[PDB]
Amino acid sequence: SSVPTKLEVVAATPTSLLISWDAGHWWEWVTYYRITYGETGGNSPVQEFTVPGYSSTATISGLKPGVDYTITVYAPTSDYGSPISINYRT
Amino acid sequence: SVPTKLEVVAATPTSLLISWDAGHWWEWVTYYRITYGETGGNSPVQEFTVPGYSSTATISGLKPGVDYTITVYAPTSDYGSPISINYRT
Amino acid sequence: NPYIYLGGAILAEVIGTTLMKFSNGFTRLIPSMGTIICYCASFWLLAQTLAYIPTGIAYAIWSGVGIVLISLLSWGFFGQRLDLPAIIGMMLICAGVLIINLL
Amino acid sequence: NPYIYLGGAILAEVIGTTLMKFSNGFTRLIPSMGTIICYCASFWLLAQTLAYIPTGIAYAIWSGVGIVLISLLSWGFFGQRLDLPAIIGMMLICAGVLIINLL
């Protein structure tokens, strides 16, 4: 019973990934989602960027092919719910 | 009052790098609009806008040998009359 | 006629303030959009009124009716009263506003 | 703590309105930027100080200290002194603030 839901990879690419999620109901829409992505066998930090809260899709570029990555989508605060995180191998 | 001293720094047969005195801090405007067209006018002219903190602007896509008229307008006519000059590439 | 645009700008700002309590620090989309729209509406109405109605009169009616409206909406959504000594101190400030405005 | 951020939003707003009077039709860059930063800060400051203090309670202290600092900064060094027998009304506003401030 939280935001967001259904974190899935729409389109893939050896260097890029297009992802989306269920932003929830209109009262559940936030003003900004921050997205965090990095190597799943983390040796180094997690690149994060924010995106306006009226969009449910986001594109990530500059990935190294063959490497498995972790992608997590957060909320402005922890009050909306726990962030959703998935894995994908480019 | 502003802008002031509109002159063409660099000049290529197809491009003109112009500059002006943007004023001085507490008299900086939000934006200037720069109009450049043929000195006679075949049918239209050309024009763009530049943020207020900038004092220079480049004008590309011109024809060699043609004399152009370049005018710079303040956001409103309250700052003074727009300054206009001429140049032949 | 301009007194009607004033009260509308008052109500618009009242609605904007009540919608801001719903925005959770501008972190909920739609309440945050509602506050921006309501304040832009009160901006446009107030600018149309100031061309006719004097400024000191506009603020006096604004602060008075505004204090009443958002206090009654703060009480109608998440009610409270004299959390600290005085509700009469609220209208006491309102009276202190009305003097240095009209007088 | 919450009344500190309320007074900070009051100060940020007053600075924004004064910079708007100095700026022309939102055309002078630096003061117009200042107004935007100030209104951005004030609205974010008031939003985060609204969850602690009641809305109508915050509305009064907001309007009160505002015009206090407005007439103060006006008479301060950008002219003005008019309606002089009304500083009592400023003391009224401060009185209404105190009976609602941490007492």
Numbering used by the authors:
A (entry chain C): 3 to 92
B (entry chain D): 4 to 92
C (entry chain A), D (entry chain B): 2 to 104
Q: Any passages from the paper?
A:
Proteins from the bacterial small multidrug resistance (SMR) family are proton-coupled exporters of diverse antiseptics and antimicrobials, including polyaromatic cations and quaternary ammonium compounds. Representatives of the ‘Gdx’ (guanidinium export) subtype export a bacterial metabolite, guanidinium ion (Gdm+), in exchange for two protons. Representatives of the ‘Qac’ (quaternary ammonium compound) subtype are proton-coupled exchangers of quaternary ammoniums and other hydrophobic, cationic compounds. The overall fold and many of the binding site sidechains are shared between EmrE and Gdx-Clo, yet the two proteins have markedly different substrate selectivity profiles.
We therefore designed a triple mutant, E25N, W31I, V34M, which we call EmrE3. When combined with monobody L10, EmrE3 crystallized and diffracted to a maximum resolution of 2.9 Å. The structure of the EmrE3/L10 complex shows an antiparallel EmrE3 dimer bound to two monobodies in slightly different orientations via the loop one residues. The introduced E25N sidechain of EmrE3 is within hydrogen bonding distance of a tyrosine sidechain contributed by the monobody, and W31I contributes to a hydrophobic patch of the transporter/monobody interface. In the absence of ligand, EmrE3 possesses a deep, spacious aqueous pocket that is accessible from one side of the membrane. The E14 sidechains contributed by both subunits define the edges of this binding pocket. The present crystals formed at pH 5.2, at which both E14 sidechains are expected to be protonated. There is a small, spherical density in the vestibule between W63B and E14A that is consistent with a water molecule, although no other ordered water molecules are visible at this resolution. In the crystal structure, the S64 sidechains contributed by the two subunits are within hydrogen bonding distance and geometry, with strong contiguous electron density between them. As in Gdx-Clo, the TM2 helices splay apart on the open side of the transporter, defining a portal from the membrane to the substrate binding site that is lined with hydrophobic sidechains.
